Design an enzyme around this catalytic site. Structure first.
Site, PDB file in Angstrom:
ATOM      1  N   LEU A   1      51.088  88.356  74.282  1.00  0.00           N
ATOM      2  CA  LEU A   1      52.170  88.524  73.323  1.00  0.00           C
ATOM      3  C   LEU A   1      53.038  87.272  73.365  1.00  0.00           C
ATOM      4  CD1 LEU A   1      53.982  91.936  72.801  1.00  0.00           C
ATOM      5  CD2 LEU A   1      52.533  90.575  71.284  1.00  0.00           C
ATOM      6  N   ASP A   2      54.144  87.312  72.629  1.00  0.00           N
ATOM      7  CA  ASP A   2      55.157  86.267  72.656  1.00  0.00           C
ATOM      8  C   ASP A   2      56.445  86.837  73.233  1.00  0.00           C
ATOM      9  OD1 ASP A   2      54.452  87.478  70.015  1.00  0.00           O
ATOM     10  OD2 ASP A   2      56.532  86.934  69.564  1.00  0.00           O
ATOM     11  N   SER A   3      57.156  86.025  74.025  1.00  0.00           N
ATOM     12  CA  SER A   3      58.427  86.481  74.572  1.00  0.00           C
ATOM     13  C   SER A   3      59.407  86.764  73.451  1.00  0.00           C
ATOM     14  CB  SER A   3      58.994  85.446  75.544  1.00  0.00           C
ATOM     15  OG  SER A   3      59.325  84.246  74.872  1.00  0.00           O
TER      16      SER A   3
END
Ligand SMILES: CCCCCCCCCCCCCCCCCC(=O)OC[C@H](COP(=O)([O-])OCC[N+](C)(C)C)OC(=O)CCCCCCCCCCCCCCCCC
Ligand SMILES: CCCCCCCCCCCCCCCCCC(=O)OC[C@H](COP(=O)([O-])OCC[N+](C)(C)C)OC(=O)CCCCCCCCCCCCCCCCC
Ligand SMILES: CCCCCCCCCCCCCCCCCC(=O)OC[C@H](COP(=O)(O)OCCN)OC(=O)CCCCCCCCCCCCCCCCC
Ligand SMILES: CCCCCCCCCCCCCCCCCC(=O)O[C@@H](COC(=O)CCCCCCCCCCCCCCC)COP(=O)(O)OC[C@H](O)CO
Ligand SMILES: CCCCCCCCCCC[C@H](O)CC(=O)SCCNC(=O)CCNC(=O)[C@H](O)C(C)(C)COP(=O)(O)O
Ligand SMILES: CCCCCCCCCCCCCC(=O)O
Lengths: 57, 459, 63, 64, 172, 606, 173, 86, 99
Positions: free
Chosen positions: H40-42
């Site tokens: 995922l992305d932060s």
């Protein structure tokens, strides 16, 4: 219990009462020196009652 | 009197010649008994002041104050037998000697028939108090406080002595009776102005008007709790009693010479009440609060109005019970926390719920809510002063608003809010501390039913 | 906190009720005085000039 | 403890009679006192004139 | 410590959308406008010019500080929320229990017995706790306020009492 | 010997019995709340009968009793005056608070100090009933300060919350400034009219009350939260929901306008002061409503609705219609108490969340609370033949039918149109629409206490005006012949008020973005009054207090003027008079000087 | 009643005769009848006990009548022997004169509530009675000072005819 | 309000993580750091606990939020804050 | 060592030894007796008993007595048509006005 012992512990409780007993004595004695015009003021001038000899004392 | 005086002085050997630990018990018991006798003296004939002897006489102004001092005397013993429990018997007995010796002087001061006799014990209260502040006071500035307290009132009191003896050489005797019956118009002249200055400045130092008030934050804060009460509950009113009495041969001159001190006092109450909002010490807060309420009484007298004196005596005595009680309030947390900084002991209602209550009516009484005598005192002066001039309500009215702001500030900052975490030496309130406060609050509300006993001689 | 409140309420009543019943009792045993003109050739007592019997008694005592 | 000392004790030993404190002292000192003296005396003189000439009305004012 | 580039923008993201909720409301809008902001946030994800990244952060907060809702929405249990410190009135500290009257203590004997176990545990664990800190504290005092774990065996974590024995958030 | 004498005091003394039992501690520490509720409910039943002989006999009496203290020519005694205002206001006050007491044991079914809460409510309750039943001004001052301090504790009930104390401080603050007018009116009546009994003040024909009435107006302004002295009321929300439901709906803030109602007979004589009432009343309506419709909090909106009503209330006084003002008082009690009743019900059910953005969809989920809110909101607008139209519509018709100060007439009209706006905002973000609250739904209203409490107020707020208006003796000449457009305007202005409000409310439903508006920035920030007038003047006064007042004057100069100067003068010269060098040569030379000078020029020789 | 009716003159109370038109009964009348034999009768019974017990053993009190004495107008100066009697009499008359205004004030308030909103016209004689009382009071003690005394009344009064005779001689011219 | 016990909590957690269309339901694991295991992305990670915040009706401080990465530790953090002990 | 002084003493808790302590002294038996005397002679004898005493003093300032003469004085003055309260308290016949 042990009247002498309680006296040794609690005898000081009397000094203030007798001081009050002393206290009333002056107010009923110092008033005599301040009598002066007792039953002399015009407003309170009242006729001598038949067994009474003086007013307030 | 030769009726209450002897029991008071006969109490002196009683403290000295008593058992080791029974000193507090015996002194407290008979001190309350002395008060019960004093309750009788409250009743007064309509116009003629109650005269007992040539040396002593009590009017309807001394009597409301006289009972307060006698009723006060047990309270210091109650309030001071905690921190001094770790002291030798001789010094313990000496402390009781100092307090009752003080209370003896007030008893014969308020009831003095001769102004010179009034002055002798009016100043003589200095010696036992100075002993109390300096010896058993717990601080470093107490030494500077003693010098400030002693020299302020003494330097003012010396002109009174020169003034009073001058009246003796001019108008013969000086007792409070013939002065009022042989009153003469004080002719407006520069010498009489300085006579007026001497006859007034001595008393006005006692009830500190603005400017001549720097000894209150020094003496009251550094003094011990027993000393803290008397310096704020009786001796402040000591100037009041002299001010009422001595303002009998100064009244073509009071009207013209009231202005300098009136503006100083009227601005002072706004000034002094403002000092509270940014204070740091709880004891200084109460002490500065005493300045503002007393400064109101300064105005109360100098208008010289039947209403003005009427609310004056009501305010002073209501002031005495309230400020003394608040001083107990400061003492209780101070012993438990060992500091007088307000923000240190936040959130105390959650810990001590009764002390939350006892503080609640304490701050409420200082608010001068109706019908509490604080209100019936302040409100009376407001009306009399407003008749004196309409702009007075602009100042004194705003004072009531400012009075509220800091009075709840001390309640909110200490009692309310979240408790302080690191403090963990807070214990349940002793039955002594709670009982001491009850004997302060219930009498205040009890008089509220009958203000006839508190309204003074002009009633 | 409760013990102190209990101590006051119980003990302050210890003299509260006996005086409270006492004040009512004198109000319902001998009653209150009533107005009367000054009788001929009689000096009124110093304490007689008051309405409430307790007030008259207080005038008979110390005052 | 440092704050309490700084707000109560250190203030005077560090005091210096600079004209900034000097003028501010008189401005917040004698200033307001005389200002209240002027307004109060001005009204007081205004009131007593009307009272003496009989201009002011207080026919129902008795409890002064 | 400080707030690096990712923390600052992540906080900016978190606070802006919460503000956007107070503005947009009507969840249909929320999801749509979140997708818009996310899309225009995605396009700049590498931009290795860190100066430009800070430059893109300049008008970012300026837009926020202009377009922020004057009454941002916060769940009640929050700083400034309606239910803030509401139950702080009741969280009496545990140490106050030591001052309970013995008759009052008798009402809950088992719990007071448990208090003894915790008390004797904190007395024993305290010595090991300070020893761990002094034997692990870096030179020149603690650089970071973070405390260490219980590296040894059968050992309580350093300074464990107040956090573990804190009053519950809902004491009533 | 009529019951109107003894009973009207019995319905006052019985209010104090629950207070005393708490001191005895025999008070039921298990069922104290029911003890209070039943007692107040009983007193309402007693409070019924004095009304009946008010309608039938029409008698108005004044009670004088135990004489506190005799002050020269001022007999300050306890006194109770049973006027139409007093006798009518007693039952509505108890009936409202009895319903509130019914609510409290539902909302406060978990607060550990609940018994203390009920203790404060009765103390507050008894405090106003002597505020509304007073004959001497001083006793009117008894309740005036009592309600303020009691409100202070009640607002700071959650004393742990820091902002609760600050709001509590704010309430006692603005009350004190308002109180200044009261004590000013206190002295003037005592000095000039030489009394505080309302009989003498009206008797002595104080038709030049210019300064006392200005003080009286200032007293009302602080208590009733009008423009200038108001933001305490919108910020009096930190107190629990029943607190604002009782105090800040129609039973604490009303006190200010009720004070003017008491002093109506002399108010009409002066014209400047009454005009000032139109000024203060008109501006209060708008600035409260303007800052109301942009609030994302149900409690804030409801409280703002109050302040607008009392803002409208003082307008009614300004046209010399004080009786109709009291009519508005009673009617406003039934609406606004239920308005806070409804909010309290939804707030507690929906996990004590008040942000209006998180409701919606409760119409089918919460039918009863929805019905009451429709009842209250429609009463607020003035739905004809409902309890709202019986006062507000008559007020507007009377407002235009007078010599109104032009802008005041327009200002009330726009405010009354704005009245529906926040009402729609309530019903729109609430039940109407799609819900927005957290997933776990615990929407419960079936508690019998909550249902009965609202229903009791519900039934009242439909027939209250009917009963009161029909039964009250006519004490005001009405206006019969109006041009149709401005007699209907009160009805119509709310009709657009509904019309545009729903339009702009459903404009948010539109998927497009909503630009931030500077006018909305002004409105939603409560008109910038708290952000400016609460941190600018507080800072200046308090910074002056320490920097100059407590430091520069007290212990920078005063300790320097008298004490330190005298100490330094003694300091400097004691050095000079104690540093002799011990030389006999210098000593005896000084002797030579003194013996030479003494026998010489000072003329001691003759 | 026990208090004199002449001192507190209460004009005759005219009471209407209840003559209702509607058939349904008056709740006021029925509730008052219930109030009659629930509270008033037990109160009457309990009081009769108290009155009969009070009258069983009655004790009297009189009213002190201070005989009048020469006031400060005839008391020679520096004679506090006679000034004290003169001063006390004046202060005694001070309280009595205060009660006179108290009586007139009570009558003023009594008529105001009695006539309701007809207060202004019905009792205007009361206002002029009180106005004359206060005016003479202003000529009297008012503005004596906090430490008021019989001497100060003489000064304030004597100052007044000084102005009055000055006014009188000017008017005669 | 019924006690928000741990199993009821974690049931609510993985129910809303599996709700995330970018998080496939069949690959749900209570102990799985959002990037190195899931991917995922932060930027997305912060969006997750905003969903958590409205799920439980309170605020997660951002300083604590960034440390909060695992679904089990998600349950752990909310448990301690709401003093859940079971 | 600067000097030989004992350090700060520990603030003793009166409850630590006897929890039933009333905060009046160290010794338990006198604490109970101190509690007895402070209360008994604090409220009952002075507060309670004194309040009844102070509530029941005889006529203060001859208050009701002052009222009583007003009634007959009121009845005297208006009945014979003389202003019910004369403007000058000191009768002008007694005094002399110079010049
Ligand atoms: C049924 C209940 C009734 C309650 C009534 C109301 C409460 C009454 C409470 C009375 C006692 C408490 C108050 C005492 C006040 C001071 C008493 C006093 O004047 O003492 C000196 C008084 C009078 O002092 P005296 O003796 O100099 O007075 C001379 C004039 N004669 C004699 C006429 C009074 O002392 C006495 O009367 C002597 C008897 C012992 C008095 C002891 C005093 C305390 C107890 C009373
Ligand atoms: C008939 C009688 C009925 C019972 C009366 C009982 C008492 C009562 O309530 O009286 C009401 C009466 C009411 O008077 P009233 O004018 O209503 O007449 C009474 C008769 N009734 C009620 C039927 C009309 O008022 C008083 O008696 C005044 C009470 C004053 C109490 C003051 C207490 C002070 C305590 C001080 C303690 C501390 C002392 C030391 C410190 C001093 C300060 C510094
Ligand atoms: C004579 C008859 C006159 C009749 C006038 C009728 C006017 C009715 C009110 C219309 C404007 C107010 C309104 O519609 O308020 C509702 C609404 C609230 O919008 P907002 O607060 O931004 O919340 C959005 C949340 N998503 O939508 C809004 O747009 C709010 C707007 C806020 C500012 C309103 C300012 C109104 C000023 C009126 C005149 C004042 C005196 C000059
Ligand atoms: C710390 C400073 C003082 C603090 C403030 C104190 C109050 C200020 C005024 C102090 C006055 C002190 C002397 C007053 C004593 C009584 C005086 C009095 O009753 O009035 C006389 C007023 O007469 C005076 O001169 C009194 C003194 C006036 C001021 C001069 C001395 C005082 C100022 C300096 C000393 C005090 C200051 C401290 C110095 C270190 C009337 O007498 P007479 O002058 O009319 O005599 C008859 C005839 O005319 C022949 O004289
Ligand atoms: C309603 C009004 C407000 C509406 C709301 C939006 C308001 C602001 C709009 C404008 C925002 C602006 O474009 C971006 C800025 O703030 S700054 C520059 C970003 N450039 C970098 O950060 C480069 C390095 N990159 C990373 O650090 C990671 O890529 C990152 C953490 C960003 C993503 O997470 P991961 O992937 O690592
Ligand atoms: C024509 C549509 C309705 C317009 C209503 C405007 C206000 C009506 C009442 C006006 C009162 C005027 C008083 C004077 O003139």
């Amino acid at each position: 219990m042990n009247v002498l012992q309680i006296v040794r512990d609690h005898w000081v409780h009397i000094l203030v009462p007798v001081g009050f007993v002393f206290g009333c004595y002056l107010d009923r004695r110092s008033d005599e020196k301040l009598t002066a015009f007792r039953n002399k003021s015009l407003l309170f001038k009242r006729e001598l009652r038949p067994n009474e000899e003086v007013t307030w004392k | 009197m030769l009726k209450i005086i002897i029991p008071t002085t006969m109490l002196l050997p009683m403290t000295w010649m008593s058992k080791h630990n029974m000193i507090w018990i015996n002194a407290t018991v008979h001190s309350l008994l002395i008060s019960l006798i004093s309750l009788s003296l409250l009743n007064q004939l309509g116009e003629n002041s109650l005269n007992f002897s040539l040396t002593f006489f009590s009017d309807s102004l001394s009597a409301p104050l006289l009972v307060l001092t006698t009723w006060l005397l047990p309270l210091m013993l109650m309030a001071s037998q905690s921190h001094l429990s770790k002291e030798t018997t001789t010094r313990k007995k000496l402390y009781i000697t100092m307090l009752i010796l003080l209370q003896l002087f007030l008893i014969m001061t308020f009831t003095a028939t001769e102004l010179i006799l009034f002055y002798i014990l009016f100043e003589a209260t200095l010696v036992p108090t100075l002993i109390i502040i300096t010896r058993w006071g717990n601080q470093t500035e107490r030494l500077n406080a003693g010098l400030y307290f002693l020299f302020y009132t003494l330097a003012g009191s010396l002109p009174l002595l020169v003034a009073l003896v001058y009246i003796q050489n001019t108008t013969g005797s000086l007792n409070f009776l013939i002065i009022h019956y042989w009153s003469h118009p004080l002719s407006n002249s520069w010498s009489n102005i300085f006579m007026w200055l001497a006859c007034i400045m001595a008393f006005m130092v006692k009830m500190p008007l603005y400017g001549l008030h720097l000894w209150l934050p020094k003496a009251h804060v550094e003094a011990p709790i027993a000393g803290s009460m008397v310096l704020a509950a009786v001796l402040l009113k000591l100037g009041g009693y002299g001010m009422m009495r001595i303002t009998t041969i100064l009244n073509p001159l009071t009207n013209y010479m009231a202005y300098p001190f009136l503006m100083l006092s009227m601005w002072g109450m706004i000034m002094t009440s403002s000092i509270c909002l940014r204070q740091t010490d709880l004891k200084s807060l109460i002490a500065y609060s005493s300045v503002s309420h007393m400064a109101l009484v300064i105005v109360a007298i100098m208008i010289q109005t039947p209403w003005s004196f009427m609310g004056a005596t009501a305010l002073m005595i209501a002031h005495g019970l309230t400020s003394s009680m608040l001083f107990c309030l400061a003492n209780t947390n101070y012993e438990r926390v060992h500091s007088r900084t307000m923000i240190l002991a936040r959130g105390l209602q959650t810990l001590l719920p009764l002390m939350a209550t006892w503080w609640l009516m304490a701050s409420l009484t200082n608010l001068a809510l109706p019908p509490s005598i604080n209100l019936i005192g302040e409100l009376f002066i407001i009306t009399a002063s407003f008749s004196w001039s309409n702009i007075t309500i602009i100042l004194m009215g705003m004072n009531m608003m400012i009075t509220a702001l800091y009075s709840l500030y001390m309640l909110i900052t200490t009692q309310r809010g979240k408790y302080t975490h690191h403090i963990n030496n807070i214990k349940a309130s002793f039955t002594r501390e709670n009982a001491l406060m009850a004997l302060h609050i219930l009498p205040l509300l009890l008089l509220t039913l009958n203000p006839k006993m508190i309204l003074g001689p002009l009633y | 906190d409760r013990r102190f409140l209990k101590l006051m309420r119980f003990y302050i009543l210890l003299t509260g009720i006996p005086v409270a019943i006492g004040i009512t009792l004198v109000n319902v045993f001998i009653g209150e005085a009533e107005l009367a003109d000054i009788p001929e050739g009689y000096v009124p007592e110093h304490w007689e000039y008051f309405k409430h019997p307790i007030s008259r008694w207080i005038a008979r005592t110390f005052y | 403890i440092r704050w309490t000392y700084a707000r109560s004790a250190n203030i005077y030993p560090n005091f210096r009679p600079t004209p900034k404190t000097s003028l501010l002292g008189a401005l917040f000192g004698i200033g307001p006192l005389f200002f209240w003296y002027y307004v109060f005396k001005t009204d007081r003189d205004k009131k007593e004139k009307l009272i003496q000439e009989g201009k002011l009305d207080q026919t129902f004012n008795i409890s002064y | 410590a400080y707030l690096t580039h990712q923390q600052k923008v992540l906080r900016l993201y978190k606070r802006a959308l919460r503000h956007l909720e107070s503005w947009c409301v009507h969840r249909d809008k929320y999801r749509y406008f979140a997708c818009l902001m996310r899309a225009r946030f995605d396009e700049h994800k590498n931009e290795k010019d860190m100066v430009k990244a800070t430059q893109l952060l300049r008008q970012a907060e300026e837009e926020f500080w202009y377009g922020q809702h004057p009454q941002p929405y916060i769940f009640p249990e929050s700083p400034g929320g309606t239910s803030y410190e509401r139950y702080e009135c009741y969280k009496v500290p545990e140490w106050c229990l030591d001052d309970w009257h013995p008759s009052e203590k008798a009402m809950y004997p088992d719990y007071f017995a448990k208090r003894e176990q915790w008390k004797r545990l904190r007395r024993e664990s305290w010595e090991r706790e300070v020893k761990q800190l002094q034997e692990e504290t870096p030179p020149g005092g603690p650089r970071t306020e973070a405390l260490p774990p219980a590296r040894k065996e059968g050992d309580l974590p350093p300074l464990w009492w107040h956090i573990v024995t804190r009053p519950r958030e809902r004491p009533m | 010997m009529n019951p109107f004498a003894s009973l009207t005091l019995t319905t006052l003394i019985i209010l104090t019995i629950p207070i005393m039992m708490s001191n005895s501690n025999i008070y039921k520490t298990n069922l104290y709340p029911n003890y209070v509720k039943t007692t107040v409910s009983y007193a309402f039943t007693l409070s019924l009968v004095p009304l009946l002989m008010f309608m039938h006999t029409g008698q108005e009496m004044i009670i004088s009793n135990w004489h506190w203290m005799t002050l020269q020519t001022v007999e300050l005694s306890l006194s109770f005056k049973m006027d139409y205002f007093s006798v009518m206001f007693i039952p509505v006050a108890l009936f409202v608070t009895w319903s509130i007491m019914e609510f409290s044991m539902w909302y406060m079914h978990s607060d550990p100090f609940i018994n203390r809460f009920f203790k404060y409510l009765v103390l507050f309750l008894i405090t106003m009933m002597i505020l509304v039943t007073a004959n001497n001004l001083f006793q009117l001052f008894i309740g005036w300060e009592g309600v303020g301090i009691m409100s202070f504790l009640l607002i700071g009930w959650w004393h742990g919350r820091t902002d609760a104390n600050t709001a509590a401080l704010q309430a006692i603050l603005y009350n004190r400034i308002g109180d200044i007018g009261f004590v000013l009116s206190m002295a003037w009546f005592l000095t000039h009219s030489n009394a505080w009994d309302l009989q003498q003040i009206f008797m002595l024909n104080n038709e030049c009350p210019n300064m006392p009435l200005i003080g009286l107006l200032l007293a009302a302004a602080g208590k009733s939260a009008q423009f200038g002295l108001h933001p305490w009321l919108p910020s009096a929300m930190e107190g629990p929901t029943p607190v604002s439901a009782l105090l800040h709906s129609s039973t604490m803030v009303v006190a200010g306008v009720f004070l003017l109602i008491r002093f109506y007979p002399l108010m009409e004589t002066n014209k400047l002061v009454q005009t000032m009432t139109l000024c203060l009343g008109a501006i209060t309506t708008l600035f409260t409503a303007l800052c109301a419709i942009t609030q994302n909090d149900i409690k804030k909106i409801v409280a703002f609705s109050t302040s607008s009503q009392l803002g409208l209330m003082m307008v009614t006084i300004g046209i010399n219609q004080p009786h109709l003002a009291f009519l508005h008082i009673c009617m406003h009690a039934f609406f606004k108490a239920m308005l806070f009743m409804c909010s309290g019900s939804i707030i507690h059910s929906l996990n004590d969340e008040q942000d209006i953005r998180k409701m919606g969809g409760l119409y089918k989920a919460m039918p009863f609370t929805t019905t009451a809110l429709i009842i209250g909101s429609l009463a607020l607008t003035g739905m004809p033949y409902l309890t709202g139209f019986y006062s507000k519509d008559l007020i507007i018709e009377a407002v235009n039918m007078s010599y109104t100060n032009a802008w005041a007439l327009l200002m009330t009209l726009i405010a009354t149109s704005l009245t529906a706006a926040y009402s729609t905002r309530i019903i729109f973000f609430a039940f109407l629409g799609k819900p927005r609250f957290p997933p776990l739904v615990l929407i419960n209203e079936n508690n019998p206490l909550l249902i009965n409490s609202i229903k009791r107020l519900l039934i009242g707020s439909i027939f209250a005006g009917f009963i009161i208006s029909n039964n009250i003796p006519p004490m005001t000449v009405p206006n019969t012949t109006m041009p149709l457009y401005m007699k209907m305007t009160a009805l119509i202005v709310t009709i657009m008020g509904f019309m545009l409000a729903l339009e702009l409310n459903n404009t948010t439903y539109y998927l497009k973005f909503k630009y931030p508006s500077q006018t909305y920035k002004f409105s939603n920030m409560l008109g910038y009054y708290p952000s400016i007038m609460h941190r600018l003047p507080t800072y200046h006064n308090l910074s002056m207090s320490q920097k100059s007042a407590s430091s520069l004057l007290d212990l920078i100069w005063l300790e320097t003027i008298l004490p330190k100067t005298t100490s330094f003068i003694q300091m400097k010269m004691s050095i000079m008079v104690s540093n002799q060098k011990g030389l006999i040569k210098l000593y005896f030379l000084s002797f030579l000087i003194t013996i030479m000078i003494s026998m010489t020029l000072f003329n001691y020789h003759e | 009643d026990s208090w004199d009716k002449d001192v507190y003159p209460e004009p005759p109370r005219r009471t209407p005769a209840p003559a209702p038109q509607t058939s349904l009964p008056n709740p006021v009348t029925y509730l008052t009848k219930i109030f009659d034999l629930l509270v008033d009768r037990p109160v009457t019974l309990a009081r009769e006990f108290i009155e009969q017990q009070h009258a069983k053993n009655r004790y009297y009190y009189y009213h002190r009548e201070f005989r009048r004495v020469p006031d400060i107008t005839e008391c020679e100066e520096k004679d506090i022997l006679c000034m004290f009697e003169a001063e006390m009499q004046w202060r005694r008359d001070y309280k009595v004169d205060q009660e006179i205004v108290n009586i007139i004030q009570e009558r003023l308030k009594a008529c105001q509530q009695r006539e309701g909103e007809s207060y202004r016209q019905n009792c205007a004689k009361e206002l002029e009675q009180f106005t004359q009382v206060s005016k003479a009071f202003q000529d009297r003690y008012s503005d004596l000072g906090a430490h008021y005394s019989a001497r100060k009344c003489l000064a304030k009064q004597k100052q007044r005819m000084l102005a009055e005779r000055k006014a009188a001689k000017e008017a005669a011219a | 309000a019924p006690p928000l016990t741990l199993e009821a909590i974690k049931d609510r957690v993985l129910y809303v993580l599996k709700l995330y269309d970018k998080i496939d339901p069949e690959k749900l694991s209570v102990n799985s750091h959002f990037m190195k295991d899931l991917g995922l992305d932060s930027l997305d990670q912060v969006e997750i606990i905003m969903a958590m915040e409205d799920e439980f009706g309170f605020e997660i401080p951002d300083i604590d939020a960034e440390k909060l990465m695992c679904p089990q530790e998600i349950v752990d953090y909310i448990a301690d804050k709401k003093d859940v002990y079971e | 060592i600067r000097l030989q002084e004992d350090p700060d003493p520990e603030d003793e808790n009166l409850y630590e030894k006897n929890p039933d302590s009333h905060g009046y002294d160290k010794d338990p038996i006198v604490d109970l007796w101190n509690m007895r005397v402070v209360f008994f002679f604090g409220f009952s004898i002075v507060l309670v008993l004194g309040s009844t005493f102070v509530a029941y003093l005889p006529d203060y300032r001859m208050q009701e007595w002052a009222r009583r003469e007003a009634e007959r004085l009121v009845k005297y003055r208006e009945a014979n048509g003389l202003p019910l309260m004369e403007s000058n308290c000191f009768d002008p016949n007694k005094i002399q006005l110079p010049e």
